[PDB]
């Protein structure tokens, strides 16, 4: 069970750790988060009390290094940093734990929510979508645009999601225009799965990461990416049986976790109606269709 210590909390802020969140007061003696489950990626996220604009945060995996948060009064944000001195770090964490200045990652034993949302998400894949190679952790915020959004402007600060475009030479074989447009199986299976992602696990990992950036940061380009990756599967007549069963579980936990009050901005009516009621896979997502119909019948 790993720890992310905080040097201090000089500004009032709502702190998120995965699906949990805590309010910290200006200069409250708060020194970090302990008992973080090993085996998963995690996200530690922030919304300042004085500017509820710019949700921002850090994807990390405690297996890759010793990470801490320190407020920078120049750039005006909580920054993740790596402590390279193992003995200094262990000594800092032990002191803060002894003084009980840390919140405990509040996981219920029964509760597989975080596993279910991050099953295919790998830190090494996150670091290719979010390029800052000198750090082992990845910064994301509300405003970062995607490579695809930028084609339609600072490349260093972009989300390099895999570009998906249903009306592109990549998506449409010369001579199979109608076939490839109405049945996206060759785009899904040959171009994306065999060609780019190599396997369904990497495809699901990007889909799950896109959803979590949409949910936690209100990142609009991430939301677009999540819906495009759903739509590419649902619009394919030929999908491996294990991928459909897994997609139904992935989407179920995403819809289950989504705050009820954000369904209006986080869910695209057209995509969900098409996917659940018109698409090739309209009858393949039983769990997802049932939670959507009981939680968001207005959208449909």
């Amino acid at each position: 069970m790993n720890t992310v210590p905080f040097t201090s909390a000089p500004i009032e802020v709502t702190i998120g750790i995965d699906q949990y969140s805590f309010n910290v007061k200006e200069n409250q003696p708060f020194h970090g988060i302990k008992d973080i489950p090993i085996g998963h990626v995690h996200v530690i996220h922030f919304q300042h009390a004085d500017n509820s604009s710019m949700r921002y945060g850090y994807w990390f995996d405690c297996r890759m290094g010793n990470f801490y948060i320190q407020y920078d009064p120049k750039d005006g944000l909580y920054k993740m940093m790596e402590e390279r001195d193992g003995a200094k770090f262990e000594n800092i964490v032990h002191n803060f734990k002894e003084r009980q200045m840390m919140v405990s990652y509040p996981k219920i034993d029964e509760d597989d929510t975080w596993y279910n949302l991050t099953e295919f998400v790998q830190m090494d894949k996150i670091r290719k979508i979010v390029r800052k190679d000198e750090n082992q952790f990845s910064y994301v915020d509300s405003s970062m645009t995607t490579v695809q959004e930028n084609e339609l402007s600072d490349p260093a600060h972009s989300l390099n999601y895999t570009v998906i475009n249903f009306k592109s030479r990549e998506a449409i074989r010369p001579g199979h225009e109608m076939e490839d447009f109405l049945d996206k199986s060759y785009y899904l299976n040959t171009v994306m799965l065999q060609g780019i992602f190599k396997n369904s696990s990497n495809y699901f990992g990007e889909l799950q990461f896109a959803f979590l950036n949409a949910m936690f940061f209100g990142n609009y380009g991430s939301s677009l990416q999540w819906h495009a990756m759903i739509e590419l599967i649902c619009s394919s007549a030929t999908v491996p049986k294990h991928m459909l069963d897994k997609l139904d579980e992935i989407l179920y936990y995403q819809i289950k976790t989504l705050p009820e009050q954000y369904s209006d901005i986080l869910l695209n009516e057209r995509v969900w109606n098409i996917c659940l009621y018109s698409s090739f896979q309209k009858n393949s997502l039983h769990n997802t269709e049932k939670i959507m119909e009981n939680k968001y019948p207005e959208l449909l």
Partner: protein, 237 residues
């Protein structure tokens, strides 16, 4: 974006453009079967691809053989239209290729855009105009070449005959849309107006009669009257 009353003069500028109308591509007669069920029988169709500035009409005849053993024909008809328009553009020299293609029906946008991915600089546009190009098959010579076709065929016409010798493209297009609107609203009456005087004939190389400027004014008046009457009837006003 969409072509409307506000940007109408754009049709007659020096940027090559084509209208595409897919209304007459998939044509059927509906009939009873021996068992008393209903069936369709396809008849020959056509794509109506028109340069509104020059009057050049690319009439691609759609022979019933293209539907043989195919399903969802009204969907396939849109894609076959976009395939044939794409093939026509690729067949034209670069300097003759259109800069825009305006589709008369919004359901043609996705099929044409996907077929034209190789031509990213050709704009595919819808229109808010309600153009009467469906009535092309009320022009006797166009109907005759479609119905007689025994295989896929492209036939080239000038839908304005020689009018551009005497009038602007704007005026020629207005005359064509009025004639086709009349033919669409009351074909029998429109055709009576156009042929009633046997001394005015259709040249072998033309579609419409050889009216003088003064006779065209009388004809155009008769077509306007036909359209308003019919409108009063349709709506009891």
């Amino acid at each position: 974006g969409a072509m409307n009353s506000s940007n109408y003069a754009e049709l007659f500028n020096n940027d090559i453009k084509l209208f595409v109308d897919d209304t007459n591509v998939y044509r059927v007669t509906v009939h009873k079967t021996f068992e008393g069920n209903v069936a369709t029988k396809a008849i020959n169709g056509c794509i109506f691809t028109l340069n509104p500035k020059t009057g050049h009409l690319f009439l691609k005849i759609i022979h019933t053989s293209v539907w043989a053993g195919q399903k969802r024909l009204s969907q396939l008809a849109k894609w076959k239209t976009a395939e044939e328009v794409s093939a026509l553009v690729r067949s034209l020299p670069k300097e003759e290729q259109p800069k825009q293609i305006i589709v008369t029906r919004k359901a043609m946008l996705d099929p044409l855009e996907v077929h034209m991915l190789d031509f990213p600089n050709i704009a595919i546009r819808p229109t808010e105009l309600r153009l009467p190009f469906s009535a092309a098959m009320s022009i006797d010579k166009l109907s005759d070449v479609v119905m007689k076709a025994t295989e896929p065929q492209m036939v080239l016409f000038n839908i304005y005959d020689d009018w551009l010798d005497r009038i602007s493209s704007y005026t020629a297009f207005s005359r064509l849309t009025l004639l086709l609107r009349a033919l669409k609203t009351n074909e029998e009456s429109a055709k009576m107006i156009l042929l009633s005087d046997p001394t005015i004939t259709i040249k072998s190389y033309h579609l419409w009669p050889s009216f003088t400027d003064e006779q065209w004014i009388t004809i155009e008046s008769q077509m306007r009257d036909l359209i308003l009457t019919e409108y009063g009837r349709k709506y009891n006003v």
